[PDB]
Amino acid sequence: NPRNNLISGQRRCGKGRNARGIITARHRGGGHKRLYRKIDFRRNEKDIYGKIVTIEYDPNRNAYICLIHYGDGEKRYILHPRGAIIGDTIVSGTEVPIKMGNALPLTDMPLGTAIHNIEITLGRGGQLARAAGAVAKLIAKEGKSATLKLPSGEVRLISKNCSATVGQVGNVGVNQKRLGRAGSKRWLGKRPVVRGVVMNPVDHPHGGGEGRAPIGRKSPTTPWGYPALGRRSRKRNKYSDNFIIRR
Amino acid sequence: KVEEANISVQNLPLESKLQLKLEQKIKMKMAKKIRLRRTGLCA
Amino acid sequence: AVPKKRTSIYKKRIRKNIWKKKGYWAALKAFSLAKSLSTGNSKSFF
Amino acid sequence: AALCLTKRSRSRKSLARTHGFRLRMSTTSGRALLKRRRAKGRKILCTKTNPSSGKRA
RNA sequence: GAGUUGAAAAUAAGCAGAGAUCCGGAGAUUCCCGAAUAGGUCAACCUUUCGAACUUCUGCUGAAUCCAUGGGCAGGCAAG
RNA sequence: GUGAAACUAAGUGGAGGUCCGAACCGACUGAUGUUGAAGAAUCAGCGGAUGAGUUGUGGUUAGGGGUGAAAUGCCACUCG
RNA sequence: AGUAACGCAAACAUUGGUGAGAAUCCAAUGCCCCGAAAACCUAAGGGUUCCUCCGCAAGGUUCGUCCACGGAGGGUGAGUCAGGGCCUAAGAUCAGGCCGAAAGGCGUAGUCGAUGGACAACAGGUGAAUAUUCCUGUACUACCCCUUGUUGGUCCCGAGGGACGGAGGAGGCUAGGUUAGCCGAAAGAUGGUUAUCGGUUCAAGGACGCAAGGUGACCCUGGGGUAAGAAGGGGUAGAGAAAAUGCCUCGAGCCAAUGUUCGAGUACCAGGCGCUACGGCGCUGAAGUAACCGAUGCCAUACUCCCAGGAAAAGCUCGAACGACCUUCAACAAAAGGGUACCUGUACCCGAAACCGACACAGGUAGGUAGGUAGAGAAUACCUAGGGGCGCGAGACAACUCUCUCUAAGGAACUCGGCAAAAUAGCCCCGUAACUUCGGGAGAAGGGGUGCCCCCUCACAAAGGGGGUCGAAGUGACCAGGCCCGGGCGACUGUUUACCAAAAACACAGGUCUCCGCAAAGUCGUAAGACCAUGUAUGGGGGCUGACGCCUGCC
RNA sequence: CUAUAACGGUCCUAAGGUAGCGAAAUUCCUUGUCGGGUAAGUUCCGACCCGCACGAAAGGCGUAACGAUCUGGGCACUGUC
């Protein structure tokens, strides 16, 4: 039964190839209306037990999103953790039971647990590990931070007084489904990316030469000319909150 | 054949439009019919 | 396929004359048909 | 496939928006065009249609 | 100072020494689009309680600290 | 048929960038045509034909720019 | 040079007209052609071409009395059909706001913008050009006017709903055709005949209105029986309204096209009898029923199955700060009683001689209707309905070019290459290999029958079995696969040089590398800022290789 | 036996082509030798190898299916001859 009053309809027209009309992000188009669902991240309804009445399939996302009622007349879509079988009960709050899929400030929870959704900073909805299976361990806490290890194999102290959810987001099985038809990609809305050794020298710094030609440049470059391997691209000074790249 | 199906004038969007009108109007009819029938039961 | 050079007035007058004259020969025939169609025994022209 | 014929029976209304006088005037450049089309001395200085009946016999 | 109702000839009735036609100074009207201006608009259109927005003037006077304000509201005039 | 399946036949089921083939889309072979009927057709054949399909009405992107399943092709018969 | 040509190989022929002039105009009679159209509408476009009467200078690839050409008059009527007065998507413009030599850029509420959602008309007549516009009859919507009541409003507001994917086959049906009855007429000059010919129609709307499918509820079937629950309904618990809770409801039926009746005791009509400058009209006017099959309409966003998960906002229905205002300005059951009813389009073409290709161009142009025989079919072939005979003709019939048919004996010997021809071909039935990813190959290959008549069986609707007869030839016309064996490249379907290149080129499913911690990286913009992402590390950008199998050395 | 070198010495670079494949869409000389096919085949298939100048993601090798692909030989069918 679609139309939860919450599928909220109007997205931004199609996939956004355009800032001004220009293709400013290459090769997007085609697909369905992929009509979107305002799921909840600013969870923020504290100390109210909600049910779980559906693991609904979200096209605008990667992980099955589950619906939750409440005692009041309220409904939300929130990502569902691994093993949130139907008709269970989750609850945000502060001292909440540590238990799959219920959120609690990051200060008040045991280190080493599996935590999926977090806040880089208060008020925002939910930023880090948020895909379809992603997980982040807590390494030891600290004065006003929490040396949290997000899902890049990468550690980063993050501000202790920000919300987070427990458990890991579910639906890991997507990570390995094969798209054999070769035009299913097209259903998803991702246009074919033409390789660059063939574009003529006006189009790409991989100018055509008689016969197949191997680069010939000192280093492989993006169509815009920057090195396309190894060249780290981080502003020299931004925050420096994170302890290690671990990349 | 053809003339006998452009006597009763209903084609591309007007077949669809009058059809929708008749579904609509009978739907209001039955809405009144059962709206009354309920009182026909509970007394 | 394309002519080299225009012909003179001389030549052209020759051929136009042959054209018209070719029309000349085909009158006296019609004049015989006339001078015979002036009422007379004949099986033609109902 | 139609022979290299550039113009097809497109709606007059659609054409008017692209080259419509109302459209022509709003742009800074467009007002400039009117300047010239009047300094030369043209008479039919657009191609438009009208939401009543775009013709007088 | 006599004849006149624009171009070309009638046409139809007119007007004029109880100044016609006409020539000047000052006026009045100046449908619709167009700065375009009541609102929209594919210009010369549609819907309209009949009449922009910017200054200006006269009044009501948000916010937080009923402060003071600016902003808003309105009735104004008519100047870009 | 095995504390448990694993597989064999039947039936239902209806999948497939599946199959043959009209509309439709497009262009491969051949002849005609080449002061053409046509500034790329006609005829006989030909490929795809529920899909990475077509198409209608409104729109978007611009000149060292746009778009490009990439030919430097297309951008109103004009494009290194 | 009076030279090529006169725009496709549908095809004209006559008699009689009109006129100064007929192959070219009109009327017959005949022949012929399309008929998934060379037919009838309609969106766009054109914009006066439509109609009537004169005209023929130029135009028409001939002619001309004729025209889409010239001249003069004339013509297109809507409360319901389309749009606006209603709503909003992509997009556009954006007050204020931010940014910027100037212009101007980004951007919110607003305002426009339909190709979409709300919303009310059908049949028959008329006529030179209009008719769902005019006329007749019957309908529907909105606003008033009248009566009884309640006094309580309308807005802003918070809610329901509007609201919406693809296939896929069932099911019930209706339009439509047949076949039959029924009524009318009939000799149609050769054998015999009526076995032949025509009509057999009526919509919107009102009132009633139900078998299918959905309760697979306990099963035997698909109905008596007993209790909670289905469509609809009352609640109460966190104050109207859904949102959530639980109980419960003479609760078991609800859903929809068809159906009936009225609309239509009516018209309508084949056929009769007179007029006539041969059209026309006049009066009469019978029967107006059943069985078959069938939809690429209808129930229908039924239902099942899928992943790639399918627009919004108004109308419209319920009510809180029962919000400004209050039976004087108000609204509802309501007589379904009486009256009124806003702008714009409407002609004509529209698979086109008038639209787009400069030509009255053997091109192109969205959507709608879809008949008969044979057929699996919207192909094909021959025809109804309707429309047309292609706007230069008549002779002769050399060579030669093209579109085609046939060719004795050989059957690739031609040739750069069997290119181009020819040849198979449909439905049944037997059989089907190498390989293989074990799906495929595979319609492999190859072989056989099939026409009509009679007969009984298997469903006993088709098909098959037996027998017969005919031709040289039996899917016999049209339509309708040539097939193998071996290689190279590319895994495949797909896309590409509009107009000399369709490919081994590009792409793709897959692989690896590398960058990016979320006010990311990358791109665009001087800037604001916008894609990225309303995503968030199994996710984003970039480079090369391109299923699958084994691998991927050394510096 | 004669040859071809299983194996050795030298300058060299940073090292000196591994597996597979091979006269190959890469071999010029070159219709390279040999075998099959043909009456006769510079095309063709299978091999050898002195790879002029193949070779491992400007991938190596091989692959069932598919090709309006290029290529060789077939049977049927014919005015292509």
Residue numbers in the entry:
A (entry chain E): 23 to 269
B (entry chain g): 79 to 121
C (entry chain b): 2 to 47
D (entry chain d): 91 to 147
Quoted passage from the original study:
Genes encoded by these organellar genomes are transcribed by their own transcriptional machineries and translated by the unique ribosomes present in these organelles. Unlike the mitoribosome, which mainly synthesizes hydrophobic membrane proteins2139, the chloro-ribosome synthesizes both soluble and membrane proteins1040. The overall composition of the chloro-ribosome is similar to the E. coli 70S but differences occur. Compared to the E. coli 70S, two of the LSU proteins (bL25 and uL30) are absent and six new plastid-specific ribosomal proteins (PSRPs) are added: four in the SSU and two in the LSU3140.
Here, we report a near-atomic resolution structure of the chloro-ribosome LSU from spinach at 3.5 Å resolution determined using cryo-EM and single particle analysis. Our model comprises of 28 E. coli orthologous proteins with many containing chloroplast-specific N- and C- terminal extensions, two PSRPs and 4.8S, 5S and 23S rRNAs. Both the L1 and L7/L12 stalk regions have weak densities in the map due to flexibility and therefore models for the proteins- uL1c, uL10c, uL11c and bL12c could not be built. Chloroplast-specific N- and C-terminal extensions are located at the solvent exposed side and the two PSRPs are present at novel sites mainly surrounded by rRNA. Subunit interface side is almost unchanged suggesting a conserved PTC. However, analysis of our map reveals that nucleotide insertions and deletions have altered local rRNA structure significantly at five different places. High-resolution map allowed us to identify the unaccounted densities as PSRP5 and PSRP6 and build de novo models for these two proteins. As expected from the basic nature of PSRP5, its density is surrounded by rRNA suggesting its close association with rRNA. However, our map suggests that PSRP6 is an integral part of the spinach chloro-ribosome LSU. Taken together, it can be postulated that the significant differences present in three (uL23c, uL24c and uL29c) out of the four proteins (uL22c, uL23c, uL24c and uL29c) present at the tunnel exit site might reflect a chloroplast-specific mode of recruitment of protein biogenesis factors on the chloro-ribosome.
